[PDB]
Design a protein around this ligand. Structure first.
Ligand SMILES: NC(=O)c1ccc[n+]([C@@H]2O[C@H](COP(=O)([O-])OP(=O)(O)OC[C@H]3O[C@@H](n4cnc5c(N)ncnc54)[C@H](OP(=O)(O)O)[C@@H]3O)[C@@H](O)[C@H]2O)c1
Ligand SMILES: CC(=O)[C@H]1CC[C@H]2[C@@H]3CCC4=CC(=O)CC[C@]4(C)[C@H]3CC[C@]12C
Length: 364
C-alpha cells in the first residue's frame, strides 16, 4: 500500500487531492494520506479522511518536527507557494520551503517513490511583474522549450527538485504546469472562481450589473483553464505511471472557451444582470471592490453563509491579473502521448465549482 503526503492540503488542488486520493477507484488504492498546512483545519476540509498535520514548511525546525516521524511516505504532492513583492524574493522563499520539506522526507522515507511538484504556465509566460512585457515563445506552450532568461521560482524549484531526488536511488519526480485553476478552496491565494463568485454575489445584493473587469482579449479571445480535480488526477497519474516518470507536463482541460460566454454563466448562477465588456473602461475588481467588507458581512448574515471575510474569499488582484491580459493556450500533446487522456468540459467545470462554493455556503 502507498502513502501520500499532500503539502498544502487546504489549497485549491491540495483539497482536490485530499478528496480523490482516498477514493477506492483511485489508482494505487488504498492511499494513506498526510496533509500539511498552517491554519487550523477548516470545516470544508473535514469531509475528507485526511491525517491533518499543521506545519509551517518555511521553518526548518517545524518541518523537521512535524514530518520526520512520517516514516511511511511513498509519494509527495507539493501544492503550495509563497508570494512576495519581487520574483527574486519568491525564488528564495519557495526554494527554502521546498528544500525544507525534501531534506526531511527523503532520508526518512525508505519507501519514498515519487515527488510530484506543481508549478504552472507562468513557467512559459514569466513572472507576474513581467507577464505581457517579455518576448515569450509563441503559444501553444509545449513542455520542453527553453526557459526564459528571467528569474522564475518555478525554475529555482525545478533545479532543486532535480538535485534532491538524486539522493535516493530510484527516487523519481514529475512537474505539473496548470493554467488558471477552476477549483474550490476559501484559503487559496489564487482562486479565480471563488473570487468571481463573491463579485457576482455583491453585485446581486447591490442590484448592480455584473460588469466585466478585463480586457477585450480575455472577453473575446480563446481561453482555457485547469480543473482542480483534473489537476489532482494528473498528479496521481504521473505518481503511479512509470512511463511518466521524470517529466514536466502541462495540465489543462482539453478544450477552449470565451469569457464572453462564461460571463453569462456566472451571471445566471447568481441572478444578476450580465454585463458586457465595455471599451476603454479597464475595470479592476481591486479598485471596484474597495471597502466592500460591510456589504459582504451583510450578504453573509442574510443569506446564511459561513463566517468568511472577503480578504480570504476574494483575491481581487489575482482575478485582475487573469482577466487583464490575453490567455495563451497550452498543449496537452505530451500528456496525451504519455497516456493521460483525462479531460474536463470547462463550462461544466465552471458551473460545478461555482456550485461547490454555494454548497459549502461560502457564497449565496
Ligand atoms: N491557484 C491557481 O489558480 C494556480 C494556477 C496555476 C498555477 N498555480 C501554482 O500552483 C502551485 C500551488 O499553488 P496553489 O494555487 O495550489 O496554492 P493555494 O491554493 O493557495 O494552496 C496553498 C496551500 O499551502 C498551504 N500553505 C501555505 N503556506 C504554507 C506553509 N508555509 N507551510 C505549509 N503549508 C502552507 C495553504 O494553507 P495555509 O495558508 O492555511 O497554510 C494551502 O493549503 C503554485 O506554484 C502556484 O503558483 C496556481
Ligand atoms: C484571459 C487571460 O488573459 C488569462 C487566462 C490565462 C491566464 C494566465 C495563466 C497562467 C498564469 C498563472 C498565474 O498564476 C497568474 C498569471 C497567469 C500568467 C495568467 C494571467 C492571465 C491569463 C493570460
Amino acid at each position: 500500500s502507498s502513502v501520500a503526503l499532500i503539502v498544502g492540503v487546504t489549497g485549491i488542488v491540495g483539497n482536490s487531492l485530499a478528496e480523490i486520493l482516498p477514493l477506492a477507484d483511485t489508482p494505487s488504492g488504498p492511499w494513506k494520506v498526510y496533509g500539511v498546512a498552517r491554519r487550523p483545519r477548516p470545516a470544508w476540509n473535514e469531509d475528507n479522511p485526511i491525517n491533518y498535520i499543521r506545519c509551517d514548511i518555511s521553518d526548518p525546525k517545524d518541518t523537521q518536527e512535524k514530518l520526520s516521524p512520517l516514516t511511511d511516505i511513498t509519494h509527495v504532492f507539493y501544492v503550495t507557494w509563497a508570494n512576495r513583492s519581487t520574483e527574486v524574493e519568491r525564488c528564495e522563499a519557495n526554494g527554502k520551503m521546498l528544500k525544507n520539506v525534501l531534506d526531511v522526507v527523503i532520508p526518512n522515507c525508505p519507501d519514498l517513490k515519487h515527488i510530484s511538484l506543481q508549478t504552472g504556465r507562468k513557467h512559459y509566460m514569466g513572472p507576474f511583474e513581467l507577464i505581457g512585457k517579455i518576448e515569450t515563445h509563441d503559444p501553444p506552450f509545449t513542455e520542453d522549450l527553453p526557459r526564459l532568461k528571467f528569474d522564475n521560482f518555478y525554475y529555482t524549484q525545478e533545479d532543486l527538485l532535480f538535485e534532491e531526488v538524486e539522493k535516493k536511488e530510484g527516487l523519481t519526480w514529475s512537474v505539473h504546469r496548470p493554467g488558471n485553476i477552476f477549483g474550490f478552496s476559501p484559503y487559496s491565494m489564487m482562486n479565480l472562481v471563488g473570487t468571481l463568485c463573491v463579485y457576482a454575489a455583491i453585485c446581486k445584493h447591490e442590484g448592480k450589473v455584473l460588469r466585466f473587469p478585463g480586457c477585450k482579449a480575455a472577453w473575446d479571445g480563446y481561453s482555457d483553464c485547469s480543473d482542480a480535480d483534473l489537476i489532482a488526477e494528473h498528479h496521481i497519474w504521473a505518481a503511479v505511471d512509470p512511463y511518466a516518470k521524470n517529466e514536466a507536463f502541462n495540465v489543462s482541460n482539453g478544450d477552449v472557451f470565451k469569457w464572453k460566454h462564461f460571463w453569462k454563466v456566472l451571471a445566471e448562477q447568481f441572478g444578476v444582470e450580465c454585463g458586457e465588456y465595455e471599451e476603454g473602461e479597464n475595470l479592476k475588481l481591486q479598485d471596484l471592490m474597495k471597502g466592500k467588507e460591510p456589504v459582504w458581512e451583510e450578504i453573509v448574515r442574510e443569506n446564511g453563509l459561513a463566517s468568511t471575510n472577503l480578504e480570504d474569499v476574494a483575491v481581487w488582484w489575482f482575478s485582475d491579473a487573469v482577466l487583464d491580459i490575453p490567455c495563451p493556450l497550452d498543449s496537452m500533446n505530451k500528456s496525451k502521448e504519455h497516456g493521460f487522456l483525462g479531460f474536463r468540459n470547462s463550462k461544466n467545470s465552471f458551473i460545478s465549482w461555482i456550485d461547490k462554493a454555494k454548497a459549502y455556503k461560502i457564497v449565496p
